Amino acid sequence: HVIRIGGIFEYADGPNAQVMNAEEHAFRFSANIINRNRTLLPNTTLTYDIQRIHFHDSFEATKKACDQLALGVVAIFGPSQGSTTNAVQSICNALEVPHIQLRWKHHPLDNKDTFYVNLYPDYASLSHAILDLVQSLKWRSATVVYDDSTGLIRLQELIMAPSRYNIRLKIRQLPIDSDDSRPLLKEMKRGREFRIIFDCSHTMAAQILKQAMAMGMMTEYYHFIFTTLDLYALDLEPYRYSGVNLTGFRILNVDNPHVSAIVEKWSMERDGVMMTDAALLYDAVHIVSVTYQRAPQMTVNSLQCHRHKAWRFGGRFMNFIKEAQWEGLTGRIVFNKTSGLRTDFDLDIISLKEDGLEKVGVWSPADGLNITNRSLIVTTLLEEPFVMFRKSDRTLYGNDRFEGYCIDLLKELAHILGFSYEIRLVEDGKYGAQDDKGQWNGMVKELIDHKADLAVAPLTITHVREKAIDFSKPFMT
Amino acid sequence: IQRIHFHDSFEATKKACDQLALGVVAIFGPSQGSTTNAVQSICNALEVPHIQLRWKHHPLDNKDTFYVNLYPDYASLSHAILDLVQSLKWRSATVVYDDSTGLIRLQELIMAPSRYNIRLKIRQLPIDSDDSRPLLKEMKRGREFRIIFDCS
């Protein structure tokens, strides 16, 4: 038998696109493999449709919308712009068609519409994963480098999140057009923090990854957490081999080996590189085929886009949709049918070594998260006769330039404990002074932020300096 | 005059066809971007300008031509508030804010901790009901004196 569907797709070119994505091929081959099965599709075939539209004109969406009504189709996809899909929702609640959703755009309370189905993960549950993991780590400093205003919309509950725990957060924006944020990364290196949350694309992820190794903050101290999922198609090994702390995310049960076999089939037919919407496409073919298996027969009729022929069986078929809750590629796929939206899903928490971003844990909405010889940098103050210049026509490098009392003290300590050292200079020319802002300087702030290894000077031992770091006992009194 | 339903862009499509069947020169926008941004798509698509009065979101690659808003600029409004509070020289603050739109309205004030030294609380009504009186009990526990108020 033959049935009929439709498909219209946003592009840069509109009609003049002559290249396919991975996802159009996944569409075609998913049709191929459902025609391969006999448990699935025993006695029916289907005619597909692919239409290619531009970016940012819903008038064409309206055009090819009611042209696809003039043919009369049932596969109602989601264009990458929102109000496209909102006009879709207007007609497909008017003439009552099920619209497939895969991303988020804004849903008001004014949305009291009915005929819409999503498979995109919900940000309240993602924020639950955020809060579960951050209080599994119990940090109190935080910083965000977000994408834009829309990302603030997406995690305003994280901006709300200071109202239940006293972790302190920094709100920081990327430069919106230039990829060279390295001056703003120097602003970050004036901030000098350790753990930042990020909303970014995988393109932005690789960009700031390249820049973070380029800016020298590729340090094992720092632990970074992100939003996206698809960094596995790019070049990562020079970055992780400095031993940096990182944790990642995945939702697809690759550990289910048939799923990995599907990835390897892809790898033949294409890093097994698949967009997550193509797994959603896979299971979209699956859910359309199984609701084709559930219901009795019907007609994909041609109706008139000037007429008002709202469909008869649309409520019935929407209920046929609403019966379905699933065991799928990312696990159990069940919907809070009060919301009727993609709300129940799990995480594949992976964390980074020098070796790799290896699997470490799992998140769920009900449970939550389920699981010497080194040259010492001697920064000193030139003090008489304690730390003074050795001066001769002989050329001196590092430690041979200096002389005085504490030089011999350091040499005696080196003869005790066996260490080498490099003598450097003080940053300002003081013992070290705290501002009324609270800003220490000198060797004090040099050792608090650990710019050097050790400090040697006639250090005034104050009542407030022990409140900063640990003193030793006074060798001189 | 196009008197239609709340949030009915297919009805707006009908009325768009009706307006070309009538034929005018000036377009006067309604208050829903679901509707009126698609209307702007039509207006720039067949070369007619368009009147806009509120604020709605308009991205970069959103690249239509035939439109002029007559709302002010949210960033300029936020900077006016910055000029007020810098004429006031405060530290303690707390925002009451309406909805998701307030973030757009004051992400500058979310960025203002980065550029100014300020102290503020992140406080919305649970918008479905009108009762916020226990949250006002939190406010009286907070006993704040200088609060931002975004609502209708």
Side-chain angles (χ1 to χ4, degrees), chain A residues 58-69:
Chain A
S58 82
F59 158 72
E60 309 317 326
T62 321
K63 282 192 68 174
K64 193 47 192 172
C66 91
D67 306 306
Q68 290 219 349
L69 313 181

Side-chain angles (χ1 to χ4, degrees), chain A residues 56-59 62 83 87 90-91 94 106 110 146 152-153 156 159-160 162-163 171-173 177 306 308, chain B residues 7 9-10 13-14 33-34 38 41-42 45-46 57 60-62 64 97 100 103-104 107 110-111 114 121-122:
Chain A
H56 303 268
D57 182 38
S58 82
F59 158 72
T62 321
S83 180
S90 87
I91 310 152
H106 181 254
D110 306 335
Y146 54 89
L152 322 172
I153 313 302
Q156 177 42 53
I159 317 298
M160 179 279 269
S163 303
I171 306 93
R172 310 293 171 261
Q173 191 189 4
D177 312 306
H306 52 85
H308 322 287
Chain B
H7 322 270
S9 75
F10 166 60
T13 303
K14 270 205 79 84
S34 54
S41 164
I42 303 153
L46 272 76
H57 184 225
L60 293 174
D61 298 339
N62 180 21
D64 266 4
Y97 54 100
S100 42
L103 257 179
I104 305 94
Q107 42 85 21
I110 305 310
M111 197 43 60
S114 314
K121 266 305 299 188
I122 302 95

Side-chain angles (χ1 to χ4, degrees), chain A residues 54-157:
Chain A
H54 294 90
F55 291 145
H56 303 268
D57 182 38
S58 82
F59 158 72
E60 309 317 326
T62 321
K63 282 192 68 174
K64 193 47 192 172
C66 91
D67 306 306
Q68 290 219 349
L69 313 181
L71 279 295
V73 299
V74 281
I76 314 297
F77 297 149
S80 68
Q81 306 325 295
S83 180
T84 70
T85 69
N86 307 341
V88 182
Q89 182 46 43
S90 87
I91 310 152
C92 85
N93 202 350
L95 264 70
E96 304 154 356
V97 197
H99 178 209
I100 298 90
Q101 304 157 326
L102 278 193
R103 194 184 292 173
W104 169 92
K105 265 89 184 187
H106 181 254
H107 290 57
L109 190 149
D110 306 335
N111 176 22
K112 298 206 58 179
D113 271 20
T114 50
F115 303 146
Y116 65 98
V117 283
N118 198 354
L119 306 98
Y120 179 69
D122 172 72
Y123 274 88
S125 159
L126 312 169
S127 317
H128 292 169
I130 290 172
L131 274 51
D132 279 322
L133 272 292
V134 69
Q135 275 187 9
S136 80
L137 301 180
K138 302 151 304 298
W139 282 326
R140 295 192 52 80
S141 51
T143 301
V144 57
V145 192
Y146 54 89
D147 275 345
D148 63 338
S149 51
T150 315
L152 322 172
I153 313 302
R154 281 200 153 143
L155 277 305
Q156 177 42 53
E157 68 276 16

Side-chain angles (χ1 to χ4, degrees), chain B residues 111-122:
Chain B
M111 197 43 60
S114 314
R115 305 173 180 182
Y116 181 72
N117 42 359
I118 199 55
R119 211 165 179 179
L120 183 143
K121 266 305 299 188
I122 302 95

Side-chain angles (χ1 to χ4, degrees), chain A residues 240-259:
Chain A
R240 65 169 195 248
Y241 268 70
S242 87
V244 286
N245 300 317
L246 197 144
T247 174
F249 306 101
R250 186 194 87 198
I251 181 155
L252 172 66
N253 188 4
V254 186
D255 309 335
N256 197 1
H258 186 207
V259 192

